[PDB]
Design a protein around this ligand. Sequence first.
Ligand code: LWD
Ligand code: LWD
Ligand code: LWD
Ligand code: LWD
Ligand code: LWD
Ligand code: LWD
Ligand code: ZN
Ligand code: ZN
Ligand code: ZN
Ligand code: ZN
Lengths: 360, 360
Amino acid sequence: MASMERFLSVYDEVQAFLLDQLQSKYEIDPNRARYLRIMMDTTCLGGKYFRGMTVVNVAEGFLAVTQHDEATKERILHDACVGGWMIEFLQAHYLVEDDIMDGSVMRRGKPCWYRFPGVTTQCAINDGIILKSWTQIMAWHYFADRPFLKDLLCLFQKVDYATAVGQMYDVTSMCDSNKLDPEVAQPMTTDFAEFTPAIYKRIVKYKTTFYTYLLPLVMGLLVSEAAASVEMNLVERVAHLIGEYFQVQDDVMDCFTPPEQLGKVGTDIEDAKCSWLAVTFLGKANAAQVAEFKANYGEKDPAKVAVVKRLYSKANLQADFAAYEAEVVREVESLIEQLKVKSPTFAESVAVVWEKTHKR
Amino acid sequence: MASMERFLSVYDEVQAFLLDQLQSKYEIDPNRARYLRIMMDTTCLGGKYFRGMTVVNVAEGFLAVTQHDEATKERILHDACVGGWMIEFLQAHYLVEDDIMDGSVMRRGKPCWYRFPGVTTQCAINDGIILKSWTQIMAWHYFADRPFLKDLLCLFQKVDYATAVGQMYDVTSMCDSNKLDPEVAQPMTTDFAEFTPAIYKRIVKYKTTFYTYLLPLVMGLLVSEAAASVEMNLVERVAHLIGEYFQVQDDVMDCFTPPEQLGKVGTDIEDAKCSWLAVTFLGKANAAQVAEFKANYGEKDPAKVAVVKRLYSKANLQADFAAYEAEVVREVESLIEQLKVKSPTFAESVAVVWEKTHKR
Ligand SMILES: O=C(Nc1ccc2ncccc2c1)c1ccccc1
Ligand SMILES: O=C(Nc1ccc2ncccc2c1)c1ccccc1
Ligand SMILES: O=C(Nc1ccc2ncccc2c1)c1ccccc1
Ligand SMILES: O=C(Nc1ccc2ncccc2c1)c1ccccc1
Ligand SMILES: O=C(Nc1ccc2ncccc2c1)c1ccccc1
Ligand SMILES: O=C(Nc1ccc2ncccc2c1)c1ccccc1
Ligand SMILES: [Zn+2]
Ligand SMILES: [Zn+2]
Ligand SMILES: [Zn+2]
Ligand SMILES: [Zn+2]
């Protein structure tokens, strides 16, 4: 955790850079500077730093096998940290805005940012916008002269857009596609015909995998000037696979993990989310159980939510999860083997990403 | 309006490009594609296209005095149009999100996008995010090989951030700065001590001037490969000046222009906005009128709103507006004269921007 230390120190630097700039070029006053400092901390700190630290880890692995001056080593580690915080702030953006979109109450055992008394939705929507603009201000400042600037900005931009499209797939996942119409209020599906594996996979791929796995791995390659070292179709396939697994864990926990341990009260049932539980349950239920699911899903009534949870328990979805978990393990190993050929170093970083995902 | 024709045709092209890409690379289905096509149209079309057309006009003026192959002329005009739509979509982003932030009802005589029955705030916040990501997707696609790419992206990014910071200054403009605290619900100011010219100028500079005037003028220079033709401090000063004037018109109309002609019911009074009317009124009112303003401002009660409007009328703010209007005219002329030296062509484009602002 020398690595973590360096990561968290660069946070303080980037924060001081951003706030200093607000004063020198944006005419900000101290009280507004303090409000943003607080906003930044509250929204960007307190997680595990998985996405940002992956950039750092990928760069550290290349540093162990690549010849450089010390000053160059330090520059590469600094860039990996700044790149990691670009991802963290991008995540922060999306969590602030998603929490508002969904009317969420808590995140990480603390209230959602919009719910803070002196924030409100009015300021919070803009605060999220600020979060994401800070990523660009970081990039243009710290990476102005870097040969990877263009590639890094273009990647970032595509990942951002993927994530927004994924959010659209998510927010629309309980509607019937043939009924989407801005002019007409959308009913919740009655047939659940679109609660399929292929459809779930589409949501998760765009909404999470791009920003959580693809971006930190490819950013670590880009700040290392190492991208031609790997087969980018392979990196993409392994990110999309690990990414899917990660969300299937999150889906299971939303239902079954105690709220104090989850950091929030899960509401995927009431929200009629296209979860791995729902999709899996529908792939194996009999006619009477499908009917009972339809009568009870997507409803705030706790009585009906508890009917859903009992259908899940009875249907033995733990056996489906274990089968899934074993197959993802096969596939992740296969892809690591394919990466080992070209870059053993990069394959080991992917192995570590997978280990941290698989046993969290 | 050959110019306008070309501008609006490039819209259809860019829309087809974006939706086609969503299908080929983002696994979108037709119904979701149609929802976004509708979103794009509703949020991006129906204004005057002032900001986008300024990019086109600035480029057309350089085309009239610069030697190029026909194919090059067409490429420059195409780039100016695509750049203009980047600004329009950036505007669309901000209007969707601001309308949600403020709980607005109507914009341009039609409901705010979030209020459409099949949209809702949940989808609308993300739709706005999409709007702004489309600007980047346009830029990277159409300008991939362009020597101005870097300069254009860096400018865009700084203007975006300026606009977000300006939105923060705006949303916080009725709070006492020394009281801003995310932990504490914010009371409306009781002293109106921060309703000053310098403070109003700070809001308007960041919130509007950057994206409405600076960005279209400098973008037109950048797609023309003409930026070293001008003194950029001068371009900045004239944009900030015209920009301020534009917002002072908007402030006056919010109060006095009939709602059917305004396209919305103005609520700056009820919202306790730091308007040019409020600031000007406070710069000339006597003690009894300041007290009466304080008793009635920032309150939805129509009785109290009509007390505010009568204090404004009695205080003869039309004389202040005319003095202001005459002084901005002096200053805008001065700056045009300074620009005429280096670029007469660019000075004429600024003249046209000012004429369209001054007599709207
Ligand atoms: O906590 C640790 N470092 C920091 C450093 C800078 C911070 N700045 C702001 C907020 C939190 C920070 C935390 C740490 C790192 C490695 C091993 C043990 C501890
Ligand atoms: O930590 C690092 N740089 C800095 C620099 C100036 C700071 N000022 C205030 C607060 C924190 C600061 C951190 C660093 C350096 C090289 C490689 C990786 C990290
Ligand atoms: O990939 C998924 N299921 C699979 C695929 C292949 C398997 N092969 C062997 C054993 C179990 C398997 C499970 C899946 C299903 C629903 C939603 C998301 C993902
Ligand atoms: O209205 C005009 N042009 C267009 C062109 C393409 C459009 N595509 C989508 C939506 C609206 C469009 C409008 C026009 C332009 C110049 C002189 C007169 C008329
Ligand atoms: O209008 C222009 N291009 C296009 C190209 C393909 C289109 N496809 C569908 C719809 C509209 C299209 C417009 C254009 C060309 C040069 C200079 C400026 C503008
Ligand atoms: O610039 C502003 N007022 C000025 C400045 C100088 C003038 N010189 C002569 C006559 C009228 C003048 C008016 C202003 C005031 C409040 C809010 C925003 C702007
Ligand atoms: Zn959500
Ligand atoms: Zn979840
Ligand atoms: Zn607003
Ligand atoms: Zn207004």
